Amino acid sequence: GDVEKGKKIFVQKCAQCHTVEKGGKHKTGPNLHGLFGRKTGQAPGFSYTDANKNKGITWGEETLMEYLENPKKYIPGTKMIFAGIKKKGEREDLIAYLKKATNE
Numbered sequence: 667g668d669v670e671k672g673k674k675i676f677v678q679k680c681a682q683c684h685t686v687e688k689g690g691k692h693k694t695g696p697n698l699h700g701l702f703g704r705k706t707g708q709a710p711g712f713s714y715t716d717a718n719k720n721k722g723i724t725w726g727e728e729t730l731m732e733y734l735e736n737p738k739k740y741i742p743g744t745k746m747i748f749a750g751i752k753k754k755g756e757r758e759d760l761i762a763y764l765k766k767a768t769n770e
């Protein structure tokens with residue numbers, strides 16, 4: 667994906683509930699720094715639902731592509747409010763941005 671396009675999607679659709687920078691605060695949702703290669707429910711100090719703590723997948727490009735299409739279908743019982751991104755390319759652009767931003 668295209669990182670600049672991703673950054674725009676992040677600002678518009680995610681930044682209202684999430685930070686990405688190292689040591690960024692938890693907001694409504696967890697700070698996402700270090701997500702890639704991590705199991706569900708491991709942002710330090712955030713209080714997750716049982717649903718997301720116990721989903722038991724590792725985050726990465728493929729699992730984010732599925733989750734972001736429809737979060738509640740992927741993690742029934744999640745408290746994240748987000749319908750989903752239908753378009754494959756927009757999911758790829760957002761994921762490429764996150765892969766950069768959450769590891770910088």
Ligand code: HEC
Nearest residue numbers: 679680683694695706707708709714715718744745746747
């Ligand atoms: C925009 C498309 C995004 C992206 C990329 C993510 N979200 Fe959220 N998020 C919110 C809350 C309250 C949670 C906790 C859920 C729970 O405990 O049930 C989440 C969780 C996530 C994750 C999982 C993180 C993990 O460590 O397992 C991921 C990858 C994630 N989000 C990405 C809250 C919100 C919002 C509040 C209205 C909105 C909007 C979004 N999230 C949007 C996004």
